[PDB]
Amino acid sequence: FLSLIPHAINAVSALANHG
């Protein structure tokens, strides 16, 4: 029921712009 796989790929794909 409770999942966090798609929520983790959202915060990682953003850091790519801020190194």
Task: Give, in order, the Cα–Cα distances in Å from 1 to each of 5, 10, 11, 18.
Answer: 12, 19, 21, 32
Burial string for 1-19 (b: 16+ CB within 10 Å, else e) reads eeeeeeeeeeeeeeeeeee
Q: Find where tokens 């029921």 sit.
A: 1
- Helix, strand, coil shares of the chain, percent, nearest 5, are 60, 0, 40
Q: How many CA atoms lie within 13 A of 5 on its CB side?
A: 2
CA separation for the pair 13, 6 (Å, rounded): 11
Amino acid occupying residue 12: V
Two tokens, residue 11: 């915060």
Q: Residue 17 has which token pair?
A: 């712009």
Torsion of CA 7, 10, 11, 15, to 10 degrees: 170
Q: Provide the 8-state DSSP code for 17.
A: T
DSSP character at residue 6: H
